[PDB]
Structure 1
Amino acid sequence: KPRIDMHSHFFPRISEQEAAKFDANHAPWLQVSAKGDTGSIMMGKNNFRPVYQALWDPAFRIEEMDAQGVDVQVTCATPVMFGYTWEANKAAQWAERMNDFALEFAAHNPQRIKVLAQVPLQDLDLACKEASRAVAAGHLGIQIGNHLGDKDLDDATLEAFLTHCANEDIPILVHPWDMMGGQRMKKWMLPWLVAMPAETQLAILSLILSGAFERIPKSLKICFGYGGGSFAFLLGRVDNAWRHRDIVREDCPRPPSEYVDRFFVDSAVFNPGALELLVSVMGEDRVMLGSDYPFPLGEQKIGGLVLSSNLGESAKDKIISGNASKFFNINV
């Protein structure tokens, strides 16, 4: 059985002065130490995140997959590369540059490294073009942020994008980014612990309660990061509301929990009971191993949590291999 990890990120070699050529405050670039082993994602002139080789260097990444026992890894852009706020033609350009970088990275060993495209989502026309092009060019689908400022997934532009992908049999992974919280969550990585899972839950819900899933064709393949946030756990609150308020029910014809057959989630929930509640709510067919490699708060032993749970033989196979094979049409 081949182990598949479908949530991992990369960042290419981009010089400071080139990030500038797009935007001197918000275009990210990669400062690497001369040692070669480490560096940081930068932002204008500011440190954004400490990183290490496996992020940019595909050769190095292979050992680490050998070491982890990971055969096939589907990887994508680091969310900070998204460029969703920017002027649209630069973002469309930026995306095309990055999705090419990504193809290269994978070319090192295209059998074992698969990529996902980023798109200039603030512009529906350019975004569908990049989606279609980049999948022509090798990508197995797209990764988008869960929202566009105060447009959430129920917005018509975002729905139309999912609908473009649906119609072209292009899979989508949705990653939270640009977290709500303004000024309250500056210490202890709260943005990662509180805002992020709520962000993701809210992507799922914006689609459910807006009646979006009645409009998007049933053939869409859409997956949600980090177990779909707290979605599964708060699903009962959601149904309850739905049953007792017209305003909650107005746009959503079926109970919200009936819609769990319309998307997938990854496995990264960091706890045996959570994963089980998750697989319980979602079904063993809709969960995929993702690790969030190679970041500090990803699963440092990939598959560990699944490999050693109270779970089905076939279910574990589905989660570590089966599900993702189909979702991404990876020839097992």
Structure 2
Amino acid sequence: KPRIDMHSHFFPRISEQEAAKFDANHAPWLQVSAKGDTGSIMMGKNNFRPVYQALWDPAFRIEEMDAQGVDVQVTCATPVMFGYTWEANKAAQWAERMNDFALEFAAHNPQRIKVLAQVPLQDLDLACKEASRAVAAGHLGIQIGNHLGDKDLDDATLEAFLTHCANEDIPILVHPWDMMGGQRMKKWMLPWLVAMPAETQLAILSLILSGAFERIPKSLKICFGHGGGSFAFLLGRVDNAWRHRDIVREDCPRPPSEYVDRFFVDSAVFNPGALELLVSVMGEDRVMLGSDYPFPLGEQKIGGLVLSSNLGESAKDKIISGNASKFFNIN
């Protein structure tokens, strides 16, 4: 009965010089302060994001896990590490390096720290090879971004990657990233508050409405980050549109709500009513506790929203433990 957090991130000890070998403007690296408790993710000479010790230091992290009552945490790259816009070979070299960094991090305590891998998703052949390599080496699955520029999950290359993972029993977590919106959505974290949930909804609907679930093997274990975005709340609208418009129906033979048995979401939705609605839509077997640890807005009491919800005790148990045990094959 381990308490499992399946949505969290790490960042490796990459120096500026190391990152420069790949891309001096675009490869992220880690700057750590003198006292060593805080740092920043850097991109070239630019500060990308201020971070703290739990992000890079697994010993420090275990202490916080202890204080949170988290037994096992599944962790994966900070999305800035993805490098989906890079030349494909360079991106594959980068992924292998990051994925090796991830295993080194988990090596501190592999019973309590699990890792998922990144892949050079812009090149289907290399992405499949890295997925298989990383898993064989000890990763429990892969984390990918939810789109590749104007390519959403219905794109043939992304469907093909998902099918490879299905065929090799490799679980996937889909994380929103590279948020839509252009220029008008800059201030007050609007990309995070508006664009991110729409990104995740768009990913899920792209799979459903394109008929991708009719082609991708049922074996696929796939989870959408941050509660599935706005998906669960806007599902009624989707069903209504499918019922009454032929162009919504053309590639999708069953009502869209029926395909919730083909994917999972994490529980990171911040509000009790929102979580209750999410569970009623997805089912108790399909929502996994995930916190977004250690980022500033990743719920400071891990599992606290779930435990303080109205959900049944067995639902709470599945969400906190059972579902992720099965999803990631954590014994």
TM-score range, shorter chain: over 0.9
1:278 aligned counterpart, secondary structure: helix
Distance (Å, rounded) in 2 between the aligned partners of 1:117 and 1:299: 24
Q: Give CA-to-partner distance per residue, 1:279-307, whole Å, 9 cap, x none.
A: 00000000000000000111111000001
Q: Give CA-to-partner distance per residue, 1:24-74, whole Å, 9 cap, x none.
A: 111000011111010100111111100000000000000000000000000
Distance (Å, rounded) in 2 between the aligned partners of 1:273 and 1:21: 48
Report which stretch shifted further, 70-79 or 186-195. Answer: 186-195
Distance (Å, rounded) in 1 between the aligned partners of 2:191 and 2:152: 18
Q: Give CA-to-partner distance per residue, 1:172-207, whole Å, 9 cap, x none.
A: 000000000111221111111100010000000000
Shift of residue 276, structure 1, vs aligned partner: 0.3
Shift of residue 10, structure 1, vs aligned partner: 0.2
Q: Give CA-to-partner distance per residue, 1:137-183, whole Å, 9 cap, x none.
A: 00000000000000000000000000000000010000000000111
Q: Give CA-to-partner distance per residue, 1:235-270, whole Å, 9 cap, x none.
A: 011011111111111111100000000000000000
Q: Give CA-to-partner distance per residue, 1:213-240, whole Å, 9 cap, x none.
A: 0000001000000000000000011011
Distance (Å, rounded) in 2 between the aligned partners of 1:316 and 1:330: 18
Match of 1:228 in 2: 228
TM-score (norm 1): 0.99
Shift of residue 8, structure 1, vs aligned partner: 0.1
Distance (Å, rounded) in 2 between the aligned partners of 1:287 and 1:157: 27
Distance (Å, rounded) in 1 between the aligned partners of 2:312 and 2:44: 49
1:315 aligned counterpart, secondary structure: helix
1:74 aligned counterpart, secondary structure: strand
Distance (Å, rounded) in 1 between the aligned partners of 2:111 and 2:2: 12
1:170 aligned counterpart, secondary structure: coil
Report which stretch shifted further, 19-28 or 102-111. Answer: 19-28
TM-score (norm 2): 0.99
Percent identity of paired positions between Structure 1 and Structure 2:
100
Distance (Å, rounded) in 1 between the aligned partners of 2:42 and 2:188: 20
Distance (Å, rounded) in 1 between the aligned partners of 2:285 and 2:330: 16
Shift of residue 277, structure 1, vs aligned partner: 0.4
Distance (Å, rounded) in 1 between the aligned partners of 2:311 and 2:197: 24
Distance (Å, rounded) in 1 between the aligned partners of 2:45 and 2:191: 22
Distance (Å, rounded) in 2 between the aligned partners of 1:13 and 1:292: 20
Shift of residue 20, structure 1, vs aligned partner: 1.2
1:173 aligned counterpart, secondary structure: strand
Distance (Å, rounded) in 2 between the aligned partners of 1:29 and 1:192: 22
2:320 aligned counterpart, secondary structure: helix
Shift of residue 311, structure 1, vs aligned partner: 1.1
Distance (Å, rounded) in 2 between the aligned partners of 1:262 and 1:10: 28
Shift of residue 309, structure 1, vs aligned partner: 1.0
Distance (Å, rounded) in 2 between the aligned partners of 1:215 and 1:317: 32
Query: 5+ residue gaps in structure 2?
Result: none
Q: Give CA-to-partner distance per residue, 1:111-133, whole Å, 9 cap, x none.
A: 00000000000000000000000
Report which stretch shifted further, 182-191 or 28-37. Answer: 182-191
